[PDB]
Amino acid sequence: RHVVICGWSESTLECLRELRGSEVFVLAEDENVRKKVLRSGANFVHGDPTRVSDLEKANVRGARAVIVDLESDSETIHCILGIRKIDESVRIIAEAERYENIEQLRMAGADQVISPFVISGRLMSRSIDDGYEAMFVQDVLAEESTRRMVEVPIPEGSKLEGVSVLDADIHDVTGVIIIGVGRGDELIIDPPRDYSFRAGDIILGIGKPEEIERLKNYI
Amino acid sequence: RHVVICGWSESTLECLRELRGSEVFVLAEDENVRKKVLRSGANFVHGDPTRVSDLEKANVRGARAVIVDLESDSETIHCILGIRKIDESVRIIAEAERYENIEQLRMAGADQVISPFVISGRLMSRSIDDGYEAMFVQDVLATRRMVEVPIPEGSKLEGVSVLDADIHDVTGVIIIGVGRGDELIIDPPRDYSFRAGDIILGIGKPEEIERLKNYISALVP
Ligand SMILES: [Ca+2]
Numbered sequence A: 001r002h003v004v005i006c007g008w009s010e011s012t013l014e015c016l017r018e019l020r021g022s023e024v025f026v027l028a029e030d031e032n033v034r035k036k037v038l039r040s041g042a043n044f045v046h047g048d049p050t051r052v053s054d055l056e057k058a059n060v061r062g063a064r065a066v067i068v069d070l071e072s073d074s075e076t077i078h079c080i081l082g083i084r085k086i087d088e089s090v091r092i093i094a095e096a097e098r099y100e101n102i103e104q105l106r107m108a109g110a111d112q113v114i115s116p117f118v119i120s121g122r123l124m125s126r127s128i129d130d131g132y133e134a135m136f137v138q139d140v141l142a143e144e145s146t147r148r149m150v151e152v153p154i155p156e157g158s159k160l161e162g163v164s165v166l167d168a169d170i171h172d173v174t175g176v177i178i179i180g181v182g183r184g185d186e187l188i189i190d191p192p193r194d195y196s197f198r199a200g201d202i203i204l205g206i207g208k209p210e211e212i213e214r215l216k217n218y219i
Numbered sequence B: 001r002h003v004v005i006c007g008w009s010e011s012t013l014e015c016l017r018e019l020r021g022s023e024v025f026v027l028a029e030d031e032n033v034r035k036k037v038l039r040s041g042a043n044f045v046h047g048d049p050t051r052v053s054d055l056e057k058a059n060v061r062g063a064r065a066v067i068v069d070l071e072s073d074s075e076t077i078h079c080i081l082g083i084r085k086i087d088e089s090v091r092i093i094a095e096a097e098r099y100e101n102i103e104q105l106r107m108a109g110a111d112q113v114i115s116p117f118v119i120s121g122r123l124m125s126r127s128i129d130d131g132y133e134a135m136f137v138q139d140v141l142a143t144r145r146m147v148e149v150p151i152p153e154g155s156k157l158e159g160v161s162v163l164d165a166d167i168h169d170v171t172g173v174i175i176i177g178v179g180r181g182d183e184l185i186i187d188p189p190r191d192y193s194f195r196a197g198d199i200i201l202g203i204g205k206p207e208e209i210e211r212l213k214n215y216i217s218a219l220v221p
């Protein structure tokens, strides 16, 4: 389908770059960003992210997801309320500028809130002696990285359905390091050898392209 | 030792929550942030982070590290230059508001640059279907968290390989990578050989982390 981005910022620019090859619509009030937006691989809709009519024009209804990052947390929350009037099921991902506004965004309808400064501050605290942890985080989240983090869903009828982590022996078989399994609303990091996989489970792993393809085929 | 923070923002506020117990000096020009800075646990120094005299009284010389986060790109650069006039080796970690200034920051002397909007933008792109990757980055940076453990001189594993070390089964800590020199080796091969100085990046619970520390300690009287 398509993804809709509300607001044009250093965060949303990086997001668009990472969605290369995907259809994207960017909705913003500053008409001067159209060229960069087009060059960046997306369609640009000039409008107000807090206005239902404009959110509808940017094709919010039925979108795979809507990403929101307006200049202010107050503007961001108004946009979320607006999206929910159009599609109460579409996934909404919003950026919070200040920690004190996170819950407000969730209440408005955000399914996920990303707080750049909370992540940066935590990384700052972990970088007093060296920068390996920050390096790890920034790199595995990049689609272009040689060894990156991938999400692989366990399809219905998978050979691993009902199979334990131990028996799946994924790392030796694929080369992919399993960091966690997403099931329902939670994430199980380093699942016990006992853990039994289920269809619908999301395997979070790290590996090179080759190893990733192997995991997909294995799964 | 002690850590110095230049400037004040939501990022340094969060950093402080993480550095509790450690001695921290915050140097900032807007006197309006003094209240919050003291409540966060840091000693406050009102001054110009771009001025050598103010950086010196904030204890930059000999610090463990200096974290720099100023709104101005130019000011961040000026701050780094000031730090380098005082201490040529102290670790400098700077925040970049815009991707385009990352290299100017390194040119000035920053050892590391953190780009909040790059990390956020990538997480946005990875969160289209679900939020597990974001859930990961959160749960690990704050039962199980990511940790760095240095291989000491004369360490038991100093010379042993990943296959032989079988650290995950022995400690329960999952090894996500090894830091050596200035390169990070993610998921070290079976043939990889631990060396003194290496930094092991792992995810585990406090007890599993402790097991790793002892499994890695040096054989010294
Ligand atoms: Ca933003």
Ligand SMILES: [Ca+2]
Residues within 6 Å of the ligand: B009, B011, B069, B070, B071, B095, B097
């Ligand atoms: Ca900042």
